[PDB]
Design an enzyme around this catalytic site. Structure first.
Site: not given
Ligand SMILES: C[N+](C)(C)CCO
Length: 595
Positions: A91, A313
């Site tokens: 992200p 992540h």
């Protein structure tokens, strides 16, 4: 002490999970299939059956480990995923738009940002970071220690998350600065001596100068880290054959983080566009090669004012990431510290690479592979500005549950069906706690979206409102269930792998198409609330799905929506529009009268 006082992740009762599981999938599969899954489940959970055997092994596992799902989860959720990290996994957090009249303005920002990171890491390493509370009880803080000491090695079938030992904390500590696809080692802490914000500035200038030397320009090796995990593992294996490459890779694997001095973007700097640069750098023709994805934090400081951080992540989740990032940003606000004088200043070292015919072939492939990702991403930043938390809370509803229900209505009114939905639920209350799943496509949501969309039914608004509130209650109930470790995904995963350990041929319980379908999150979401003017976003997890990350504020709600252009079904613009209509419909429903 020397060992956590936090509770261990609980193992929910077998029957509770199996009953909830069936309850979750009934409305998501045909009646014929559900009928078969009921029998399959009934047999799996029968007295003296396989399920109870596995449950006992899990209880044994719970006793012998600090967290019984850590290993299974880490591998299942990320290390086994073969998809390239950009968009699919990593992200990105977009900071506010910056204004850099000159290159020194960009550099001063980077210097200040690097300074903020060093100061934050000092707090971390000194264990001075205030223990988070469950909004409440203490929360596990392990994720914080993985912020700057994690690297994700690629593997042929399974990746490896490497955690640097404390005793093996380098001397001096360094960051890798990426400029023009060239990587430079920038030492930042020698003997407890932290480089001044002024020295960092001076060093950054030397880096920009060297990076602009054509005679020394090396291949854009970082491009390789943007490829599929099996592809990168193969290309890396080639690189490792040489001593020079092993040395360079090692420096990257042991850096604190990366600071990417990106080239200007040839497009307008709208939130949507900035987010795209942060997600995939825009492809090789832009900044797509000015990266190194295996490393956890990549802070981007673009010449044109586009700044933010790309996050791997596997080491930690969104909450910890935001706490860190907002601390850094706030620190850049506080007046420049004092201590900053130092003299002998060695020049930053450029990382060398020993190329070859092979590598060039891998570079070309990765460039083409990354281009498909850039072209396939359909992304949009939609800002809902009619209302936010304030209005929602006045309806006696959790903003999160309210938004989760809106998303279900948006998906239904657009696609005409509800799908297995994912919503991250933090389990940091338990040792090494990462996350579990909140399955928002509940039976209540279905009844609500159907009542809303089925014009022919002519359901009274007053009835739609009761269905709305019941869906929000069900959403909040599942949420509470998940965060207290009583949900089902992690539980089923562990039972699944413990079974795999017994025999490679998984039980029918897990080969069941209902189980497989239940884990294909066509709608993957999460709430990443911020207090600063920044936002988080990420891609979908399945080819035919969406990626919806929302940031609710008092009067507005930010929605970052992603999907793949390859799927004719999905459309980020139409979904964002469906979200708007759903939030409006819900407001109107809540603004009705009583009796
Ligand atoms: C994309 N997910 C929702 C699965 C993870 C975000 O933290």
């Amino acid at each position: 002490s020397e060992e956590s006082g936090l509770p261990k992740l609980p193992v929910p009762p077998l029957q509770q999970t199996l009953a909830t599981y069936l309850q979750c999938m009934r409305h998501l599969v045909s009646e014929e299939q559900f009928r078969k899954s009921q029998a399959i489940v009934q047999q799996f959970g029968a007295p003296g059956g396989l399920g109870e055997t596995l449950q006992q092994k899990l209880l044994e596992r719970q006793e012998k480990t600090a967290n019984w799902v850590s290993e299974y989860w880490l591998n299942d959720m990320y290390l086994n995923n073969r998809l390239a990290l950009p968009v699919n996994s990593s992200p990105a957090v977009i900071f506010a738009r910056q204004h850099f009249p000159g290159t020194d303005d960009q550099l001063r920002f980077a210097a200040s940002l690097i300074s903020g990171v060093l100061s934050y890491k000092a707090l971390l390493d000194s264990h001075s970071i205030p223990t988070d509370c469950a909004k409440g009880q203490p929360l596990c803080m392990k994720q914080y220690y993985g912020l700057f000491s994690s690297y994700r090695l690629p593997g042929h079938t399974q990746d490896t998350l490497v955690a640097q030992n404390s005793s093996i904390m380098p001397e001096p500590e360094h960051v890798i600065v990426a400029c023009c696809n060239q990587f430079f080692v920038l030492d930042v802490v020698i003997n407890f001596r932290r480089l001044s914000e002024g020295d960092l500035f001076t060093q950054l200038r030397k880096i920009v100068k060297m990076a602009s030397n054509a005679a020394a320009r090396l291949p854009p090796i970082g491009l390789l880290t943007s490829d599929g995990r099996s592809e990168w593992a193969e290309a890396r294996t080639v690189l490792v054959k040489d001593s020079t490459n092993r040395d360079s890779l090692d420096m990257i694997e042991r850096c604190i983080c990366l600071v990417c001095l990106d080239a200007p973007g040839g497009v307008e700097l709208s939130d949507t566009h900035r987010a795209l640069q942060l997600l995939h750098g825009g492809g090789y023709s832009k900044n797509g090669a000015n990266r190194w994805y295996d490393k956890s934090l990549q802070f981007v400081v673009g010449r044109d004012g586009t700044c933010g951080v790309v996050c791997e992540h596997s080491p930690f989740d969104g909450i910890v990431l935001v706490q860190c990032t907002e601390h850094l940003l706030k620190h850049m606000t506080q007046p420049e510290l004092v201590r900053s004088p130092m003299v002998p200043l060695p020049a930053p070292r450029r990382l060398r690479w020993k190329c070859s015919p092979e590598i060039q072939g891998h570079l070309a492939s990765s460039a083409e592979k990354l281009q498909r990702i850039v072209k396939n991403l359909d992304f949009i930043v939609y800002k809902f500005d009619n209302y936010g938390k304030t209005f929602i809370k006045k309806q006696k509803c959790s903003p999160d549950a309210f938004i989760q229900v809106a998303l279900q209505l948006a998906f239904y009114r657009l696609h005409r069906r509800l799908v297995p939905t994912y919503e991250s639920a933090s389990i940091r209350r338990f040792q090494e706690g990462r996350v579990d799943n909140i399955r928002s496509a509940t039976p209540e949501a279905l009844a609500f979206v159907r009542a809303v969309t089925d014009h022919k039914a002519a359901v009274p608004a007053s009835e739609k409102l009761l269905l709305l509130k019941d869906a929000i209650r069900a959403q909040t109930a599942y949420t509470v269930m998940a965060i207290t470790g009583m949900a089902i995904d992690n539980h089923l995963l562990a039972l699944r792998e413990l079974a795999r350990a017994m025999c490679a041929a998984l039980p029918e319980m897990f080969m069941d198409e209902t189980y497989l379908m239940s884990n294909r999150f066509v709608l993957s979401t999460s709430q990443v609330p911020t207090t600063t003017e920044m936002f988080c976003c990420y891609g979908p997890v399945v080819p035919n799905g969406y990626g919806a990350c929302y940031n609710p504020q008092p009067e507005t709600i930010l929605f970052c929506i992603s999907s793949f252009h390859s799927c004719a079904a999905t459309s980020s613009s139409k979904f964002a529009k469906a979200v708007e209509e759903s939030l409006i419909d819900m407001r109107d429903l809540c603004s009705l009268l009583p009796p």
